[PDB]
Design a protein around this ligand. Structure first.
Ligand SMILES: NCCCCCC(=O)O
Length: 80
């Protein structure tokens, strides 16, 4: 939805990257094994396949992708 700062606290439901590719579920290990996930990062709200900023990357909320050749990509939430 709307994001503030780096979207650290973003809890919106975008599920596709800025490029229109659908995100992979954090709880999943295919096509990509996540290094960030609910088991390991309990407080980051890594729900489903939603865009999240677990590492606070300055480019914003991102997600693992369903493209075996694109491990992760940033999504476009609008600035609150
Ligand atoms: N800064 C976003 C990308 C982090 C890489 C993702 C990972 O391999 O856990």
């Amino acid at each position: 939805e709307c994001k503030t700062g780096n979207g650290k606290n973003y809890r919106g439901t975008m599920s596709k990257t800025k490029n229109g590719i659908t995100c992979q579920k954090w709880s999943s290990t295919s096509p990509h094994r996540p290094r960030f996930s609910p088991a390991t990062h309990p407080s980051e709200g890594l729900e489903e396949n939603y865009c999240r900023n677990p590492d606070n990357d300055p480019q914003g909320p991102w997600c693992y992708t369903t493209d075996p050749e694109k491990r992760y990509d940033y999504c476009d939430i609008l600035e609150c």
